[PDB]
Amino acid sequence: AVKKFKPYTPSRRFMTVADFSEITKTEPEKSLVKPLKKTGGRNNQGRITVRFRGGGHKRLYRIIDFKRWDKVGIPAKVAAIEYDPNRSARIALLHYVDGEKRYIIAPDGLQVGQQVVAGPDAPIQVGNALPLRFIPVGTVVHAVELEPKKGAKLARAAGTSAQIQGREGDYVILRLPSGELRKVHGECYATVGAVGNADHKNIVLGKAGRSRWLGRRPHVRGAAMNPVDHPHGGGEGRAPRGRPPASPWGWQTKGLKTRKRRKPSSRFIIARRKK
Amino acid sequence: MKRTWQPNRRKRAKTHGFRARMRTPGGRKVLKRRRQKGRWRLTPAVRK
Amino acid sequence: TAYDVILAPVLSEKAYAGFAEGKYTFWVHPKATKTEIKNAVETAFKVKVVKVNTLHVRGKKKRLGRYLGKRPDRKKAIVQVAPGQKIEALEG
RNA sequence: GUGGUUCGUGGAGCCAUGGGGGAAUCUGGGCGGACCACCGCCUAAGGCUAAGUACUCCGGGUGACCGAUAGCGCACCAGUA
RNA sequence: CGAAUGCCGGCAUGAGUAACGAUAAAGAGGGUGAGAAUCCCUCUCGCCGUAAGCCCAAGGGUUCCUACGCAAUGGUCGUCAGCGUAGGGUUAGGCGGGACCUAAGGUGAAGCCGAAAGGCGUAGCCGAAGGGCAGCCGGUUAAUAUUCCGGCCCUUCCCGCAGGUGCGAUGGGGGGACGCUCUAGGCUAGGGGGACCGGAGCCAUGGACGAGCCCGGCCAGAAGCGCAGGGUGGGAGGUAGGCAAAUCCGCCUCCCAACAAGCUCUGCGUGGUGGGGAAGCCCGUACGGGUGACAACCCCCCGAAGCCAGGGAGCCAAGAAAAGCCUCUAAGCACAACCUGCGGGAACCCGUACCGCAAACCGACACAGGUGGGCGGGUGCAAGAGCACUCAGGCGCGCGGGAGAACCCUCGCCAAGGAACUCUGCAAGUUGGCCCCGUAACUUCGGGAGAAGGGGUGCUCCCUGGGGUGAUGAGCCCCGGGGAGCCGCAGUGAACAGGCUCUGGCGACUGUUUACCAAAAACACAGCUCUCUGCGAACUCGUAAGAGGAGGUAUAGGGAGCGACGC
Ligand SMILES: [Mg+2]
Ligand SMILES: [Mg+2]
Ligand SMILES: [Mg+2]
Ligand SMILES: [Mg+2]
Ligand SMILES: [Mg+2]
Ligand SMILES: [Mg+2]
Ligand SMILES: [Mg+2]
Ligand SMILES: [Mg+2]
Ligand SMILES: [Mg+2]
Ligand SMILES: [Mg+2]
Ligand SMILES: [Mg+2]
Ligand SMILES: [Mg+2]
Ligand SMILES: [Mg+2]
Ligand SMILES: [Mg+2]
Ligand SMILES: [Mg+2]
Ligand SMILES: [Mg+2]
Ligand SMILES: [Mg+2]
Ligand SMILES: [Mg+2]
Ligand SMILES: [Mg+2]
Ligand SMILES: [Mg+2]
Ligand SMILES: [Mg+2]
Ligand SMILES: [Mg+2]
Ligand SMILES: [Mg+2]
Ligand SMILES: [Mg+2]
Ligand SMILES: [Mg+2]
Ligand SMILES: [Mg+2]
Ligand SMILES: [Mg+2]
Ligand SMILES: [Mg+2]
Ligand SMILES: [Mg+2]
Ligand SMILES: [Mg+2]
Ligand SMILES: [Mg+2]
Ligand SMILES: [Mg+2]
Ligand SMILES: [Mg+2]
Ligand SMILES: [Mg+2]
Ligand SMILES: [Mg+2]
Ligand SMILES: [Mg+2]
Ligand SMILES: [Mg+2]
Ligand SMILES: [Mg+2]
Ligand SMILES: [Mg+2]
Ligand SMILES: [Mg+2]
Ligand SMILES: [Mg+2]
Ligand SMILES: [Mg+2]
Ligand SMILES: [Mg+2]
Ligand SMILES: [Mg+2]
Ligand SMILES: [Mg+2]
Ligand SMILES: [Mg+2]
Ligand SMILES: [Mg+2]
Ligand SMILES: [Mg+2]
Ligand SMILES: [Mg+2]
Ligand SMILES: [Mg+2]
Ligand SMILES: [Mg+2]
Ligand SMILES: [Mg+2]
Ligand SMILES: [Mg+2]
Ligand SMILES: [Mg+2]
Ligand SMILES: [Mg+2]
Ligand SMILES: [Mg+2]
Ligand SMILES: [Mg+2]
Ligand SMILES: [Mg+2]
Ligand SMILES: [Mg+2]
Ligand SMILES: [Mg+2]
Ligand SMILES: [Mg+2]
Ligand SMILES: [Mg+2]
Ligand SMILES: [Mg+2]
Ligand SMILES: [Mg+2]
Ligand SMILES: [Mg+2]
Ligand SMILES: [Mg+2]
Ligand SMILES: [Mg+2]
Ligand SMILES: [Mg+2]
Ligand SMILES: [Mg+2]
Ligand SMILES: [Mg+2]
Ligand SMILES: [Mg+2]
Ligand SMILES: [Mg+2]
Ligand SMILES: [Mg+2]
Ligand SMILES: [Mg+2]
Ligand SMILES: [Mg+2]
Ligand SMILES: [Mg+2]
Ligand SMILES: [Mg+2]
Ligand SMILES: [Mg+2]
Ligand SMILES: [Mg+2]
Ligand SMILES: [Mg+2]
Ligand SMILES: [Mg+2]
Ligand SMILES: [Mg+2]
Ligand SMILES: [Mg+2]
Ligand SMILES: [Mg+2]
Ligand SMILES: [Mg+2]
Ligand SMILES: [Mg+2]
Ligand SMILES: [Mg+2]
Ligand SMILES: [Mg+2]
Ligand SMILES: [Mg+2]
Ligand SMILES: [Mg+2]
Ligand SMILES: [Mg+2]
Ligand SMILES: [Mg+2]
Ligand SMILES: [Mg+2]
Ligand SMILES: [Mg+2]
Ligand SMILES: [Mg+2]
Ligand SMILES: [Mg+2]
Ligand SMILES: [Mg+2]
């Protein structure tokens, strides 16, 4: 669902907060697999490289497992589903019969008490992770690797996933969260199921703070500035741009493609996007 | 009103201090210059 | 060098006041240690030292004419002697 | 593709060289202002080498130089207040 | 040289002029002295008192104390001083830093990059007002005091002795260890009564010898007991993990126990006992001292925002690190070693004065400005750190004395009128707390509600109901309900204290901005759309290495325009 409120204050008649039911079962993170101060900071060596970041609530970083091939064959029971401030998805804390404890980005439907496991003989079912080439084509999977052993990179945001469309040589073909058709090596590990907390995208912030709480500082439009500041600056009394819509740096911003042309990464991508 | 000089000793030392002046060629040059000029104080007089 | 640690007695209302108890105060080397002083005093005036307190004494800034200056900084050490023991030299 | 020279593309050689191609050992190879033939000059792709020349913080000797608003910012406890 | 709003210097004019720095405020009698409205004392008077009192951090650097002093500095004066000369003055194993820890950041073995200079950067190191760490109450000086002295109480090292044990890490694990809001039960600080203990004294001006008036009736305290709380399960087997070295931790299984107990740790009571101990009177220029008692040192009540603390609940924005500490074992070593007693020793460096919402700091000044944290009493007003008065303390603002003009400022009142004023009701006034009635369009059903509009408000006496603490009784606190009556022009009798409504424009709303002429219909904003990005992402910085994006991955990022919501 999603929490609604009665309009007892303006803005409160609009904000909605996540339904923390899937979560629950645990609040404080696992002191062991989380001790990692998250280094905050909106720019590199002194200079701001990403405008409007900063402020925002303090955060501990939960280190998660983006490559499960480590523990091939060792089963693990799902201990808890927790909240993770650094991602759209929630995470599942799991207890390996091994003793070892790990955090997985919690898949949709993965319940506490269930058992998961990785490897080529993993029983195709939500939670388990296997090398793509061992998963039944048509299977919806998430946290897919893009190149064998380099870690999970595709389909990780709340409620996302990819579907295996076909096999072909050492390569299998995926339909990414973006609608794009990509060829990804058959050895790339992926874990069965969709990401979960797919309701994420519906929460309405409701007010200017909250945006501040998430660490997003106010974004000032180009038109609101002077020429020294941005191409859309200046003009006496509200201007109409001036053709053509461009960024504060100069590159046109309506439709101009930015993907590097001669990129070898092409070839492997068949389709493009959703429109 | 609140004026521009807000004395802080740690600050003064870390910023204008002898060691700070030594860390860079730009600061080492200042020392060279003050010295040549015969300045009695090469570095802002400050203690603790 | 034991006689290099103790520069001289202080001489002053307050200092004398200490003599009643085994409390003799001296002007000592700015760098001297409490422990250094204990020994220095023991061998110099042949006594048993049991406590040593020290404090720095910043020099008074002075001016003779348009010429401005300061007096040398100092260290004062008030050494306490073992029960019933007197530093003869400083009595009188 | 450029720099150096009096040479700013010029008929542009000579000396350096970032790129590409890439030899020969005196029956060799460079130069004499495109280039060619004569006649000549010189031996590249290893290094070293006093003296004559430059300067003046410092010491000295001189002045049709100054004489305390001058002369060094400072004749004085000044790169100070 | 006569000129350059010339340059350096000197001296004029305005001029005995404006000023002398908050309108909190003065008067007098003594004293000192060559001279003081200005220094000292005494007595009156006024001001501050969520202070204009006290304490800490920063900054300042002897401004501290004292003796001689008054040229100058002090907006006047000066015998006085934050001023001149000189002499004194700052005392620590336990307070704060350092012989500890890590934070952003900084630095930087390896390593990367760049014509040079130099830019990065893993481990490490540095880095504090964060984590760690053993002292409380008194007394003394002209000037220091958890530092000196006194009482009581602790901490680490080293050596010896006795008794225990697998002892042994810079490695492993636990622990340190963390948010916002609201909160329980106990306490403590703090405060208020007391007909009750102690106490110099006082009955004035009609009365009162009165439960009369006035002052004080505390503080510290090991072990051991008490009371409140916090932290913690205990066993026994397996054992792929903690870059296996573990008896530890972590996982599995079952013999117990399970709003606990027990063991532990804090807080607070008490505790042998040590200390402190008013008013008033006497001594004293000064500072104080006797005092005044062999001082009493007890009882109720109120009560924290503080302690027990790592307590509980709820919530989303999901809330440092590392060492100390416990534990595990590696090398080693087991005639070492660690651990507990008990004795005898050891325990360095720096700071410590003084000012500190200010005349000593930042503003050229003894500047009406600025300056972080803690304490900040009493009575009343619904409450409070608000307002009025006052304790303690501190001050009356470092020129005065007169005069009673115009005019200026700040303030008070006003006949009849009542916005006729004027760009504009600008300004000022009106209204103002609390309680009870009672409130319209419209609406996103929360609002508009303090809508408006009224009524009540003091005091005396009678009766009566609830609760808190005691004990269920009295007291003492805390909220009420009903009656009669009294007096003023007036009862939130003083101070703090909305004027109301109707209708348009513009932005939704709270918010942000041109520090020193513009706070707005401007920026922002939740929300909507377009567009780029397949992750060595796109974009940004940078020559480069590298870094931000992000230890993120399409319900992400970047860029752009519009700007809740409704159609
Ligand atoms: Mg940096
Ligand atoms: Mg904007
Ligand atoms: Mg503009
Ligand atoms: Mg432009
Ligand atoms: Mg820019
Ligand atoms: Mg200045
Ligand atoms: Mg600073
Ligand atoms: Mg200066
Ligand atoms: Mg000391
Ligand atoms: Mg040329
Ligand atoms: Mg050329
Ligand atoms: Mg070449
Ligand atoms: Mg070449
Ligand atoms: Mg040639
Ligand atoms: Mg040639
Ligand atoms: Mg030729
Ligand atoms: Mg030639
Ligand atoms: Mg020729
Ligand atoms: Mg030749
Ligand atoms: Mg040669
Ligand atoms: Mg040669
Ligand atoms: Mg040479
Ligand atoms: Mg040579
Ligand atoms: Mg010469
Ligand atoms: Mg001169
Ligand atoms: Mg002359
Ligand atoms: Mg000279
Ligand atoms: Mg000069
Ligand atoms: Mg002239
Ligand atoms: Mg002329
Ligand atoms: Mg002139
Ligand atoms: Mg002049
Ligand atoms: Mg005149
Ligand atoms: Mg006159
Ligand atoms: Mg005049
Ligand atoms: Mg006049
Ligand atoms: Mg006047
Ligand atoms: Mg004045
Ligand atoms: Mg005045
Ligand atoms: Mg008054
Ligand atoms: Mg008053
Ligand atoms: Mg007040
Ligand atoms: Mg200081
Ligand atoms: Mg002085
Ligand atoms: Mg003084
Ligand atoms: Mg005097
Ligand atoms: Mg004067
Ligand atoms: Mg003085
Ligand atoms: Mg250190
Ligand atoms: Mg560096
Ligand atoms: Mg670093
Ligand atoms: Mg360190
Ligand atoms: Mg610290
Ligand atoms: Mg600390
Ligand atoms: Mg004092
Ligand atoms: Mg003591
Ligand atoms: Mg052991
Ligand atoms: Mg740890
Ligand atoms: Mg009483
Ligand atoms: Mg009595
Ligand atoms: Mg009478
Ligand atoms: Mg009382
Ligand atoms: Mg006690
Ligand atoms: Mg007690
Ligand atoms: Mg409380
Ligand atoms: Mg360390
Ligand atoms: Mg040492
Ligand atoms: Mg002090
Ligand atoms: Mg102030
Ligand atoms: Mg303060
Ligand atoms: Mg003054
Ligand atoms: Mg002031
Ligand atoms: Mg303030
Ligand atoms: Mg009250
Ligand atoms: Mg009130
Ligand atoms: Mg008083
Ligand atoms: Mg003044
Ligand atoms: Mg009238
Ligand atoms: Mg009238
Ligand atoms: Mg009119
Ligand atoms: Mg008119
Ligand atoms: Mg008005
Ligand atoms: Mg009345
Ligand atoms: Mg109570
Ligand atoms: Mg009011
Ligand atoms: Mg009001
Ligand atoms: Mg108001
Ligand atoms: Mg607005
Ligand atoms: Mg506003
Ligand atoms: Mg601001
Ligand atoms: Mg302005
Ligand atoms: Mg502002
Ligand atoms: Mg405004
Ligand atoms: Mg304004
Ligand atoms: Mg680049
Ligand atoms: Mg990152
Ligand atoms: Mg707009």
How many whole angstroms separate alpha carbon A84 and alpha carbon A105?
9
The phi, psi pair for A110, rounded to 5°, reads -70, 110
Instruction: Please give the method by which this entry was determined.
Output: X-ray
Are A139 and A124 in contact by the 8 Å Cβ rule? The answer is yes
**Which nucleotides on strand E sit less than 7 A from a protein beta carbon?**
58-62, 84-92, 103-107, 117-121, 142-143, 147-149, 173-179, 239-242, 249-252, 315-322, 346-352, 361-363, 369-371, 444-446, 508-510, 522-527, 530-541, 546-549, 551-565
Please give the C-alpha separations between residue A271 and each of A124, A175, A268, in angstroms, as whole numbers.
27, 9, 10
Q: Resolution in angstroms for this experimental structure? A: 3.0
What is the Rg, in whole angstroms, of the alpha carbon atoms belonging to chain B? 13
Residue A76: CB atoms within 10 A of its CB come to: 23
Q: Which two tokens stand for residue A160?
A: 């996302």
> A268: closest CA among A169, A190, A181?
A181
The two three-digit tokens of residue A175, written as one number: 């339909």
Q: How far is the CA of A168 from the C1' of E552 (A)?
A: 31
d(CA A275, ligand 54 centre) in Å: 60
In terms of Cα–Cα distance, which of A131, A157, A136, A153 is closest to A144?
A: A153
The Cα A153–Cα A147 span in angstroms is: 9
Distance (Å) of CA A232 to CA A219, A249, B44: 14, 11, 47
Contacts of B10 (CB under 8 A, 6+ apart): none
Percent of chain A that is helix, strand, coil (3-state, to 5): 5, 25, 70
* Angle made by CA atoms C73, C3, C44, in degrees to the nearest 5: 120
Coarse DSSP helix, strand, coil percentages of chain B, rounded to the nearest 5 percent: 55, 0, 45
Q: Do the bridges between strand A129-131 and strand A189-192 make them parallel or antiparallel, or are there none, so unpaired? A: antiparallel
Among B18, B13, B47, which residue's Cα sits nearest to residue B31?
Answer: B18
Structure tokens at A252: 């046109």
**Rounded Cα–Cα distance for residues A158 and A195 (Å):** 6
Could you tell me if B17 and B10 are in contact, meaning their C-beta atoms sit under 8 angstroms apart? no
B45 touches strand D (CB under 7 A): no
What number of other Cβ atoms are within 10 A of residue A181's Cβ? 16
Closest CA to B11 of B2, B23, B3, B20: B20
Relative to beta strand A162-168, strand A171-175 is: antiparallel
| Distance separating alpha carbons of residues C8 and C25, to the nearest angstrom | 9
As given in the structure block, the two tokens for residue A66 are: 């983006």
Q: What is the distance between the alpha carbons of residues A4 and A256, in angstroms, rounded to a whole number?
A: 40
Token pair belonging to A196: 């979960």
Cβ-based neighbours of A142, under 8 Å, separated by 6 or more:
A105, A107, A155, A156, A160, A161, A162, A190, A191, A192, A193, A194, A195
Distance (angstroms) between ligand 45 centre and the Cα of A131 equals 87
Sorted by sequence, the CB contacts under 8 Å of residue C87 that are 6+ apart come out as C24, C41, C45, C47, C81
The arrangement of strands across the sheet holding A91-96 comes to A101-105, A91-96, A76-82, A115-116
Bridge partners of residue A170, in order along the sequence:
A168
Q: Which residues contact C89 (CB under 8 A, 6 or more apart)?
A: C45
Nucleotide nearest to C66 (CA to C1'): D77
Sheet holding A181-185, edge to edge: A129-131, A189-192, A140-142, A162-168, A171-175, A181-185
A270, A263 Cβ separation under 8 angstroms: no
Q: Nearest CA to A86 among A135, A138, A34, A153?
A: A34
H-state helical runs in chain A: 208-211
Classify residue A197 as exposed, middle or buried by CB count within 10 Å of its CB (0-12, 13-18, 19+). Answer: buried
- Distance between CA atoms of A56 and A209, rounded to whole angstroms? 10
- What lies within 8 Å, CB to CB, of B37 at 6+ separation is none
| DSSP run (H or E) holding A95 | strand A91-96
What's the one-letter identity of residue C86? K
Q: Where are the beta strands (DSSP E) in chain C?
A: 6-9, 23-28, 49-57, 61-64, 67-70, 74-81
Task: Let me know the angle formed at the C-alpha of C39 by C37 and C43, rounded to the nearest 5 degrees.
Answer: 120
